[PDB]
């Protein structure tokens, strides 16, 4: 049961019944940026002695903190902005819950109702703005319909696919007093009949039947999967079929595993790819058919019978057809194939031995490799020991370019939401504030930023977050002078000619530019840089060891390139397996 | 006469089209943040040699520092970014320039054409999320449409009203070959019919007789005459009426003048507030009677005849019924008027002495006042002193809050365009990147960033970008270690109840958190701090005479209140003069 | 019920338009594309493979055969009224099935659907999704256009068919052989019909009649005609019906026949809205 903090019977402020709303979801942690037109729920927020406030240096930095909350727990996360340029900043982390269905819930304030459309003080229609980059969005036009609204935008954030919701309130609504019904029915007559079924026994015994007369299955995992972590390893057991993975995926079925196939894609293994290229099988879970992992569609698993599970309709069919679907829960699915699988498991009798063979052989003559030049760190190398030093069981949250990708090469993660990265909008400063957040969700967790200079540079104000808050975040920069992923372009697709990709100072080249050590001094943060391989180790063991927030500024060769990689809209036969930067 | 660097018959990529395109407009610098979905356009950037481009450290940096580049020249501003994320990063800036009318040109890079729709890699409905922050948009579909295309976005970002225009362009047109038609006629032919025509001599004549038929005119000065410093000035010898200015419309009229009233509003002085409400004549030219101004409506002027001229036809009657009205350009409205009231000046024999002494006294008894506690150092007295140490000649940006308001009304701007700052939006982190547009627009003068401490951390980023462009900038930090503005209304009206208010550390709340002068130095910046009153001046001084950038952190107590103040939707009546935030 | 629906079969989808494979219902098997196509690709595998196959689904099309014999399309005669589903039969016959029917929306356009066998397709234009009263005659001038030596008649309700009754004038003009086999049953007869069943047969504005003269047809079909200079005639006995309609088809150019149907007609069998197979009605109409 519940304890309000008013009366039944006694009038209240918008923004206290707003803050309520929240408390009654079980909102623990928000990030709220104030402002002008939302300075009524910052005070309802000091009134609540259950909901912990984390003040943000910039709102993208909110949004994204949010993100990080949500990744790595599966609750939902929630920021708050005011209205204007507080709401505006929140549109890249808006649009990047959108594209990796990740589960959040945005509050900006607005300009009182009559004052909307005069163009007024800080008014931005936010809503119209949002409306294509969010899951569901609300403009609150009374104060009665708070309770409604609220309960629903954390219904459409978290049910079905995931994704974010925005709210905005007016300043007036704030200020009036009421008395708010809690027990109002939601009005989403549409959307919840539209909301997938428990998956029947018919289609999941058709399954279990193509699985029998297969002989190269594949198992293609996506962030579909991140809740389904015990049943889809109960899957394999029972199965023993491979799992290639997407960059959404990484976690579900553990990498240290030795029926892990890692990352497909375009910048995936090489085995793994194979795989999904000769598979006659691909039980394709929790997965969006993007371009980045199939590249050339009519040339991606071309042999094979495919099994679609998604939890979306609009997904089953959109690029590829299934010969087999089920639109629900891959949870649910997975629950129900096991139990044939288990029971009719003698009768089966399932061996893939040869085909895992085929793969493990793959794996032996093609695995991820990188190459050590002279005392230099190689970013590869540096990752690897991180995975060591912390036995696989840290929250890793990166930025975007080649430090993601090797981030997520070579961590093997052993359970899922360990793994934060922008992957459909691939959003540099990602990093850092989902750290913050992820560190706030899950604070006895070790959890490292492992971030890119220009990424890290973006949101480094955040710096000042993780201090006052007192945060462990580890922050394993990998330091290159240059935006590597545009420069690695460059240098196979443009003839190395350099578009604005340096990112340090011309006048002395050979100086590390900026001293991000620094940037950690500013806010009160330990840090420090290491150049030579061999002290490597123990400074990464140093940032671990020493309490709290802490930067390590790993300095490594711009002539390195992300390998494996197929080109856009290339198939497997298309993949680059040599080169780099150097001449 | 213009020469290409392509053969008239020579086929090249739609991205040396675009820049081209650029240079054929006078462009001679962008501000592009590269990308995957953008590297076309800035391989064809490096191929121009009369355009050069400032690399920011964020795309939000980047639209900022195109604004300031724009605010303080009166060209048009460009900046550049990637599809998704790098577009979405520019929304701000967007918002921003729609709202204080400033003539900006966004390129944004987009997924290829028939991946548009499919939730692609890093794609983003910008158009769609855009469109009601933008003056106009587009989204390109044919590589013969980029020449006209950006002639009409430079024509629509430049003309009439001044408004952000943006432009997407999908790769795969950035790719493709073809040869530019250059002379094709633009496709705005209900825009260019509602272009205003020059205005009649009938209401010029009408305003010249309500001026000599008045005792108490008051003139009504905005944004709009940001080109009409000159014209203005002009009128004002001829009529000898006193000038009330905007937050946008400051140094239109020198407010060293003694017929200055400096600025009126919210936060405008009392004498000015006094005019407007006692005058018979009201003078609006170049304004949109924002709420921030006027307070309540039918208070404002109400005793005044108002004459109302502006070149958007919206803004005419939207707010106030005006009893004469010309909507065209301000400037040939004055240049009109001028001849008129010179050629019959003897026969006029305009003369408000009487009324200017009103005016003169409530100049006396409430002029714009500070408080100097012991050594403590007065934000408002740094400002002063600025003023006298730079003669008043020095290009101004700003952040938003207490230290935006102070600047404003601290500093006696000679010449427009001096005066960069977010009105409208009132967006905070504006000043740093605005200051480095301003700088590169304006090689030869000072430029200066009053900032606060909330403000500049949020791009603070920027240091780098001003570093490595060798730019002059000037940081003046205004460090209160609180959101000033938030702090001020927390004080006034909820009690001094603190909510988030505060930017150190709690931890050690009596340092100066963060170290900003560590910022600097990261970047590679001379910085100081100050925090006595009397090593102010010279480390003001010294601040301007050192070379190149400087930042100056500048440290106040933070119980300063913005002064005077009028209430949301107040009168005259209302006007808040004593009180702080000290007990 | 979409759960009831084909609940215990396994469902193949064949559509164009993947938006659609999946939408209400979960295949089992999918295929995007065109069914032309599919159809074509199906048969070379089902004849090389004819031997191997052995299809003979007797059993299960006997068992359909039963339900065929015991709950057939079923019409009633009271004395000499015409009943509106044995017009439509006769028709068929008249024309062996050969001609292009368009209709308007509402009871006529059921039995129209029910009691005409349609030999090709294309034969059959119908408003379905938006089901537009005032689509039969425009449709069926259209078709006459484009099919100048094909049998057009437009089988339309009294009150479709005055909705767009202007277009007589134009098929005039047009000199198109178009017929209008008008059933008349003074009524918006589909929303009389849920009255009847679903709101104790209370009249809310069905009646489209003279309530001054309720025992005059209203109003007088044949003069709109006439108007236009369009030989028309009406037919209330059910003997005079045959020779009626066969001079509908036998006289050149246009002609409108004003069928007198009772209005307590009901469109049977039907499933209610949201109903399942079991809740199927078989029995009843308008009459006490
Ligand atoms: C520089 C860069 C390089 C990249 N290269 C690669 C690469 O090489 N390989 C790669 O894989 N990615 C890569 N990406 C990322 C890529 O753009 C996408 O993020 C990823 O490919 C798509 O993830 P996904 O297929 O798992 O689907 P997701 O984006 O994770 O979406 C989840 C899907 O599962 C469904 N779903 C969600 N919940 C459930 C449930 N409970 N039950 C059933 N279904 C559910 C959803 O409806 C959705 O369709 C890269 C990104 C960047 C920035
Ligand atoms: C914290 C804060 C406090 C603020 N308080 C105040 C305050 O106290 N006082 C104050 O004044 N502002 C204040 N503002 C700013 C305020 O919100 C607006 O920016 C400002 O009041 C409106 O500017 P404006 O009236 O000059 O019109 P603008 O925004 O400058 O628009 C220009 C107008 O002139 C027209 N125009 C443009 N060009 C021409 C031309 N060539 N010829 C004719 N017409 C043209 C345009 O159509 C437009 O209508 C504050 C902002 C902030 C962030
Ligand atoms: C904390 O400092 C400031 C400063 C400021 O103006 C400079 N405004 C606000 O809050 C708003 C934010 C957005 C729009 C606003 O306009 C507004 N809000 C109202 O809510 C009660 C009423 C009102 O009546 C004119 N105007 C307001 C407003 O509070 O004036 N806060
Ligand atoms: C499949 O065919 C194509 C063709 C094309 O243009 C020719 N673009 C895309 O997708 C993108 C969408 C957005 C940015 C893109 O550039 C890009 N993509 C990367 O994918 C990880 C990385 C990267 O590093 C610079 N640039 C790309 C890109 O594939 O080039 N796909
Ligand atoms: C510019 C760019 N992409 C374009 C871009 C621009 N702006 C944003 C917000 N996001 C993206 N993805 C990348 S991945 C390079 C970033 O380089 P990095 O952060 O230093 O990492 P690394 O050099 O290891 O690739
Ligand atoms: C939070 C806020 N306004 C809300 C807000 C939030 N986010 C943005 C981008 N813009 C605004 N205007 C202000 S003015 C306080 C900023 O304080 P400051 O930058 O340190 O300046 P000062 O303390 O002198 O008022
Ligand atoms: C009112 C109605 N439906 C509502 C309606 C209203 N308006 C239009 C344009 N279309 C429709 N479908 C029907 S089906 C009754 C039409 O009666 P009818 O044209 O005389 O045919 P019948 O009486 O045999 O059902
Ligand atoms: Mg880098
Ligand atoms: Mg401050
Ligand atoms: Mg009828």
Same mark, same amino acid.
């Given at each position: ?227 389904? &972590? %015990?049943? /889809?390893?109960? @899957? ?6 491979? $799992?290639?993975?997407? =960059?959404?995926?990484?976690? !579900? ?25 000769? &598979? %006659?099988? /691909?039980?394709? @879970? ?6 980045? $992992?199939?590249?050339? =569609?009519?040339?991606?698993? !071309? ?28 949870? /649910? ?251």
């Amino acid at each position: 049961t519940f304890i309000s903090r008013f009366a039944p019977d006694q009038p209240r402020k918008g923004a206290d019944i707003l803050v309520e709303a929240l408390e009654r979801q079980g909102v623990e942690t928000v990030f709220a940026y104030p402002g002008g037109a939302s300075m009524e729920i910052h005070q309802a927020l000091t009134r609540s002695s259950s909901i912990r406030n984390v003040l943000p240096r910039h709102e993208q930095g909110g949004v994204f903190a949010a993100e990080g909350y949500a990744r790595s727990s599966g609750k939902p996360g929630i920021c708050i902005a005011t209205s204007g340029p507080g709401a505006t900043n929140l549109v890249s982390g808006l649009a990047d819950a959108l594209l990796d269905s990740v589960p959040l819930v945005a509050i900006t304030g607005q300009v009182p109702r009559r004052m909307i459309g005069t163009d007024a003080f800080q008014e931005t229609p936010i809503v119209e703005v949002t409306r294509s980059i969010t899951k569901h969005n609300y403009l609150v036009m009374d104060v009665e319909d708070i309770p409604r609204i609220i309960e629903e935008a954390f219904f459409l954030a978290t049910s079905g696919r995931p994704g974010p919701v925005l709210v905005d309130v007016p300043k007036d609504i704030q200020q009036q007093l009421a008395i708010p019904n809690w027990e109002q029915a939601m009005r989403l007559p549409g959307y919840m009949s539209r909301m997938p079924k428990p998956p029947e026994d018919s289609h999941l015994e058709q399954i279990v039947r193509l699985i029998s007369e297969s002989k190269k299955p594949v198992l293609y995992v996506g962030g579909g999967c991140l809740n389904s &972590s %015990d049943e /889809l390893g109960r @899957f394999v057991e029972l199965t023993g079929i491979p $799992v290639a993975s997407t =960059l959404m995926g990484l976690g !579900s079925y553990p990498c240290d595993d030795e029926l892990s196939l890692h990352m497909l894609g375009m910048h995936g293994t090489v085995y793994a790819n194979y795989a999904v290229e000769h &598979s %006659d099988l /691909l039980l394709a @879970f929790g997965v969006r058919f993007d371009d980045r $992992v199939t590249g050339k =569609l009519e040339a991606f698993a !071309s042999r094979a019978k495919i099994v679609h599970i998604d939890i979306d309709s609009a997904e089953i069919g959109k690029n590829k057809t299934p010969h087999v679907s089920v639109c629900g829960d891959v949870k /649910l699915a997975l629950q129900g194939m096991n139990k044939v699988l288990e029971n009719r498991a003698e009768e089966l009798k399932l061996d893939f031995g040869v085909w895992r063979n085929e793969l493990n052989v793959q794996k032996q003559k093609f695995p991820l490799s990188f190459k050590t030049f002279g005392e230099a760190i190689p970013p590869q190398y540096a990752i690897k020991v991180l995975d060591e030093l912390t036995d696989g069981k840290a929250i890793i949250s990166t930025g975007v370019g080649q430090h993601q990708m090797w981030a997520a090469q070579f961590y093997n993660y052993k359970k899922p939401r360990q793994w934060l990265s922008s992957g459909g909008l691939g959003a540099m400063g990602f990093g850092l504030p989902a750290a913050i957040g992820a560190s706030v969700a899950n604070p006895d967790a070790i959890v490292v930023d492992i971030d890119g200079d220009g990424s890290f540079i973006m949101n480094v104000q955040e710096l000042a977050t993780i201090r006052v808050e007192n945060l462990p975040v580890k922050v394993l920069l990998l330091n290159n002078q240059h935006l590597g992923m545009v420069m690695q372009w460059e240098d196979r697709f443009y003839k190395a000619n350099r578009a604005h990709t340096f990112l340090g100072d011309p006048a002395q080249e050979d100086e590390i530019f900026p001293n991000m050590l620094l940037f950690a001094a500013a806010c009160g943060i330990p840090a420090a840089r290491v150049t030579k391989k061999a002290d490597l180790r123990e400074a990464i063991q140093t940032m671990l060891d020493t309490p709290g927030p802490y930067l390590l500024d790993v300095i490594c060769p711009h002539q390195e390139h992300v390998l494996p990689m197929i080109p856009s809209g290339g198939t497997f036969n298309d993949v680059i397996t040599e080169g780099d930067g150097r001449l």
